[PDB]
Amino acid sequence: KVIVFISGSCLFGAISRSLFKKLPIPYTVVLLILGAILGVVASNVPLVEEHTRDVAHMDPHVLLQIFLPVLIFESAFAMDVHTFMRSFSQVCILALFGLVVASVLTAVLAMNLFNYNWNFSEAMMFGAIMSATDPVAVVALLKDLGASKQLGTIIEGESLLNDGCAIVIFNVFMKMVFFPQLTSTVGQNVLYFLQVAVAGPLWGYAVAKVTVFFLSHIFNDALVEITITLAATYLTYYIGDIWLEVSGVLAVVVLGLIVNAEKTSISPEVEVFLHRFWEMLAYLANTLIFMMVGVVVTQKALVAVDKMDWFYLIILYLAITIIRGMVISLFSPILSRIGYGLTWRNAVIMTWGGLRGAVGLALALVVENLAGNDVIGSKFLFHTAGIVVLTLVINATTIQTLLRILGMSDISIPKRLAMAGAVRRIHEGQNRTLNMLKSDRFLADADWDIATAACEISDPYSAPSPREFADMMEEARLRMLKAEKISYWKQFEHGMLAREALRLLVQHAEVAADEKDQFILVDDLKKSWQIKGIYPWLKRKLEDLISECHHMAFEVTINIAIVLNIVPIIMEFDALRISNYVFFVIYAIEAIVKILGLGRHYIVSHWNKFDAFILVVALVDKVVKLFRLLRGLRMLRLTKALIPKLILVVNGKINNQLSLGYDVGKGYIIGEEEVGKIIDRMVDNKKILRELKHISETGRLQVVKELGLLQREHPGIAVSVKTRQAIRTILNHSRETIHELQGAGLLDEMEAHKLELTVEIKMKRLMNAPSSIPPPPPENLLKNVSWLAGDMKLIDFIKARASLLHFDYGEVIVREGDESDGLFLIVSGLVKLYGKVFEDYLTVGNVIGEMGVLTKKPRNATVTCETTVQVYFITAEDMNIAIDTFTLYPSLEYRLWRVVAIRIATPLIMEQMAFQGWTQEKVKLHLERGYLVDLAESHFQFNIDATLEDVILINGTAYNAHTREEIRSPCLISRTVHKLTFQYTATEEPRLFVVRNAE
């Protein structure tokens, strides 16, 4: 009865999909043609008619209750959220108002022109049944071309709201038409529309939050969470359909959108499996519905054919096209005023890319089935089939031409240059590999013509004067922007930036490059991280200032008793005497708790007052009915267990914003530093490079000062986000070391898998990080200095010899050219350093001035306080005493010298830059493995070996072995020198640093 048709449907869909990949027309028109042929054969032959009758005419209920929710939910699940949320107001107003006006204009035009004695409800149904769209083909083509991502996002997101409102309007009007027994009270209809618009999405959001909370507590288990997600989606649909006839789809769409938004609490394999599952279901439904409508329209077309009926279809197509055009034409200025740059090219490509999908066909089938033996069903089916087959051919084939006429399909010159370079590199590499392979001792017999013919890559895209000064500065600006963009890409690929910060940086760089003479500006980034200054923060502050056997199990049991005692309230809204006895027991329990609280000084102000009032009401227990109804006010006492959840969620929101705001600034600073380092030797004119360096320095200084002030504003979030970043970096480098060990063959693959699983579990806990408000104490900062960890005696001696100082805003601590009084450690506040040309801003965690206590040199900086600062001061004499006291192999002077050597040697290695692809992190790690070598053991003579990779001289004077050149510190000695000779000078001790190989 059903098996033959479904198997044939799967086979024909597979055949058409595989065979029509090259052709521009979609496979759906082919499926429609096959449905028509099957309809003709069923009309003639009785056997295939018998085999087709059972599925050709199904119930309307199964169609509009299974096929439509699957399609809508898949279309919601496939789409992302952030790109949709960036333009929510625009797409919302466009979809709603365009649908309303298109429906009403189509209805009145059908009434005026079709010459059918139709009520207004039928015309509204017809206008709503040709308002659904399906831009899947055109959005896929636009993604393939990659013209404008935001335009594709908007055209994809419009159709979802379009389909939702179309299904709502069609449902209510079909209920009005085909079941006239319902009462037409205006207030009842208003309440129904209100509950459709409100209760649906709220129910969907509630179940989405509940299922996300349950998903948040599952580790390394796949099956459980897949089953939970599927059961939750079906339960939402079932409840939303039993409660309201049509709101189920409007609830399940919100469910899918929200659960898709939370992509950081669902394992990637489950995500890809669910995506594949829902896409496969949508495919199956789509092919089935096209072939079904094909056979039914062929079987019921000969009895509804007329010359005027055939003529009306063209007029209908013209009408729908012109109204779709004029909607955007009328809405262009309003959508331009809101803050979105609508343009005529985007307008015309959007208004021309209006297709018709399976939703209109589904509603047509429903109407035709419900009409029974009448003419309106056949006319609806014929007109909608005609218009869909007209548009799906004509518009889908001419959309490519209309794209190619305009500039969307064009390819920029830089993309062509990059592709040409890449193809040249691939061809050179393949030629080199072939040349190496032809000289092997085993593969010297392969058919080389066949070998080199099969593997080949083809280019897919290919088929003093003021004017001179302006040209040079324009070229320099373009080169700087290009270097900044590739630095952002390299940083993202290394993993130091999230995707969102990368997208913001790339978009800002492209916008600045589009302008004639505008560099990248910090004001845009300033408003990018300025989202902290928002009214949710003020709400959090006000609710925090408004708000505030001793075991916690006591209060937990009280809450559990309250939850269990909720149920008799629902029972109210012998059998009742046992409940009354339980009530009296609860009253006695509350009395005992309040007696204990009276023993606990009863200092509660408002909660105690409300508890006393509720106890007074409970002691009392038509006026009887009101008393029994209103005695359940004690639920107000539960609100003291509800504030911490709100403060936790608002802290989570502010942390989620602050992480992005911090990441974008850090990425911009690192990229600017790298570009400023690399631009040194490329450019020729001195004035141009000087001006560019000044601009970059001004921007960097502004960004670092603003970010430091933002961190100073409130530490509870900054500490948490910094800790999360540190743990993520440590785990990433551990995973990299694990992969390196596995690749070197020193570890079996199963053990590598076990360690990777452990690292993945740690990363999952990091993602489920704790509450983001840990406050740090100053003693931990004092004991957490890089050259102080692991030495209890040193820590105790420093704590004994330390001092605490506090300064207000505007004070000056030390000045350059003065004697070095001691060492500093910024433990609270922000500080500005300026001395002779460079200017910097430091914050908590950074020490200041080791030169005075190592080299005994005068201060080379000037210190000012931008706010109230707390600092720890250590005298120089105590540091000298500690140096002369501890003489272990990890000596204090050893660690201080290592730290300053690393700090002063990083810029030189970065300045070399003969290598490419090395960032700050890689250079710091490579420099970290080294250890400085004392010259006392080597008798001030050093022999350079092949084992060591790179050497640096920090402080001292260098003498060659034979040429005897006097070299001043600090510099990187060349590989030319072989033996280093040194002399003992009391004024300055030489300092050398080496880096060994791997082993």
Place this chain on the structure above:
Amino acid sequence: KVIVFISGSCLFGAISRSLFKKLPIPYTVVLLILGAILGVVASNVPLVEEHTRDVAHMDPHVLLQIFLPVLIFESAFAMDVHTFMRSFSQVCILALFGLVVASVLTAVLAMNLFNYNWNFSEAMMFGAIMSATDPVAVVALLKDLGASKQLGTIIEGESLLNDGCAIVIFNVFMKMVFFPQLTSTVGQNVLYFLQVAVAGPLWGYAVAKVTVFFLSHIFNDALVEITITLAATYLTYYIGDIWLEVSGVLAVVVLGLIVNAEKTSISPEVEVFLHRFWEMLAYLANTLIFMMVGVVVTQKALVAVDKMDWFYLIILYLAITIIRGMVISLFSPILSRIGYGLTWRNAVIMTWGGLRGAVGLALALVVENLAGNDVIGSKFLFHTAGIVVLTLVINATTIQTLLRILGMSDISIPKRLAMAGAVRRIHEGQNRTLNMLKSDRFLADADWDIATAACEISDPYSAPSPREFADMMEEARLRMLKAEKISYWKQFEHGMLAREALRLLVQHAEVAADEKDQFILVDDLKKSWQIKGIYPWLKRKLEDLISECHHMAFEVTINIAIVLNIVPIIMEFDALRISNYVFFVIYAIEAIVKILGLGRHYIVSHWNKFDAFILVVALVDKVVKLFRLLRGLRMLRLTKALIPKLILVVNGKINNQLSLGYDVGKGYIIGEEEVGKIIDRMVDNKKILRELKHISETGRLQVVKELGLLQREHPGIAVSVKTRQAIRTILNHSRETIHELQGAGLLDEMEAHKLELTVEIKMKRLMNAPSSIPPPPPENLLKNVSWLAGDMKLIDFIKARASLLHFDYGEVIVREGDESDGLFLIVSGLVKLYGKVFEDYLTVGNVIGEMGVLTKKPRNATVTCETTVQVYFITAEDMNIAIDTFTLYPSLEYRLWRVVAIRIATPLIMEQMAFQGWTQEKVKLHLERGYLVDLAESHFQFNIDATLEDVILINGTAYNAHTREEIRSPCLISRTVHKLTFQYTATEEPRLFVVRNAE
């Protein structure tokens, strides 16, 4: 009616699975307990009884027609094939005979002891229902421990055949019992059993091959593959269930096993999606069936309970355990004789790990439902539930103890050492990263205690004298085998070896290491690739020697007409007069074709005779019925279109064998060369290293000679496999270059994705490589020399000046110490080279003796022919003329010198070895980028710069700039030398080679 129970089932399964991860007992016993509690509540409360009735007692048809096939097919799909196929006979005989004897012994024991007036059929049904197993828990635990992989494979594969035979026996005996109206003819039963045993698996294999053929022609499409596979599986099940009542499961198991075997024709994403889908379905069915039996057992156990009834369960458990033990006890010698080393520890752990799963519960539910109002159903259900809950607790908890008593759970010392080293490296790396991070300018505020306390990783495992000479040689052998194992792992990770070759090599290395004084031997590898010498090859040879408008469209249309004319032949087994006219037209067409063949000299011997006989039969058209039945023998003419398919499939099989046979030998040779190179400096005793080097050289020589002879045997397969290897290597290096370009940030990620997609399509075409019989011509080999490509004039001149020589076996071509007559090129055959100490074997594709034509030195080799050889010879004076003629920048002498320099400089770079993780391929690629520099332009003075990486002097004499040392070629000059001074000597021209940096 059903919604509440299914949703509760999903919820309870999720809860128990998530909560009982730590506990040793399986989660299913919790589901059984929950089912019992729900049964009690349903017995008391009427509402839950109403909500449970609709699922507690289902129609048994849906149970044994849906739940069982899903479980069996998932268990078949999850298991692999190759490990199953390695021990097919053993598991087959064990499963079949053990099931038979267990069933009959359990039946007779029930008859003797249970004191129930039962027929023998009920006892046999009991024996069949107590024989089903489910080792999922124990095999998962054994994989986690990783004691013996083959034991896990055998214990997993036994249960599949056990379940299949159990369901078959249960089906036939239930049909005998509960439907006694069927006829009991012995011949009918024999024919039925034969058709069950034969027609099922053949039908499954046929549809498996058809669907594999259809899936073989789909590119970059995922949805079509999934839908086609699912539809094919369901169609196989439906046909196998319509035709036979029970053989559907036996067909679908073969379907799943075969489609899982072909893992090289299905995209990985489709594979993982299908695995996840079927695993999820099996999970859902499993939890639902446990809770259903839990809710039904309690309500029916109240009326069937006795002291002796409770007593019998323990006796039954003892009986099943002892019979399962004695089966293996009796089969130990027979299974030892076949060629498998059965041991008592594996025997006891296998016979103790016998569990009971959902299959027995399903069959018990079916019997209880079909019994209706009787006692036998309740007794079967109670006994099955009791035995399964007994074993799933007792055996599943004591299996870990019985494993820990024996040596399976022990951990070897090398694994502990490797884990200790890896954890030490991870800890050092984490400490280094933390030390670097604490000095950053942004992350100086993170709570360091929380940071360093979370990202921590701990090792999971921990909680002259002859005796001296023997110890040293044992240590040397262990170290050599170790280094060989790491060499194999590194080669596999680089990608040069397939998984099976790696598994064979690792297994052979472990077997050799287990023996006291046995090295790795080549005889095992000899029989590993000796599978070519098999009777399929002789069958192919005999069928090839037995067998042999002119457009091919003519024969194609003839075949199509034959295919369409098959249908009236089936119709045989006005309406008939038009068919008769059709056959007359076909006879006329055949007459025209044969007339044309007569015009084509009619030289066909056998096919022409059979065609003439069939034409004689056709011209003729109760004897009438026989003639009409036997006139359709013309189908014999189609067999000439079937032979090429057989030769293609047998060629594919022999190619699939030869690829592995070639890979294992190549991997062994490379690993032996690397270990011999690395063993030079590790060991101390000279005699030991000399003996090991001699052993390694003997093995390498034997392997290379045997592999060369195997290649010489037939070239049609060797050429194809070599070409496939070359194209795969080229594509892999192209993909690596693409990833490097993407990581360097010079290419946008979308373009990188496009290029990766193109490379993936090329790789898919490589996998769907053409027929593996391309024969090579000699002129292509002559023109495909490395220093001859790209020069048409040079190729033509060489072809004009070339000569061809042929030699027989045993002849000697040239001898050492003689004048260099010319240059050699082996274009056919195999050749042995021996001269003074090293001995080698060369084959087609390798040139011989460039030293005589470059350095004008006497021959240093002796050449013998191991078989008939064809050689191209080029005279020395012609090469001198070509050298003195061509003077372009890519000169001939330039290319020859580059080739010899690379060949002679690879071993020095390998011997240098200050580096790890570099193979022959990486060293060759690094050496390839270099170019030799002429000293005429530099006036015989070279200045070493920092840009160049490595330099190597091939021929000449080296002098330092100042120290003036005389250095003899060939050697790698150290980094110490700065400027190279050279002099002009007519007797020897200096030759230098450099390698530059990346840019």
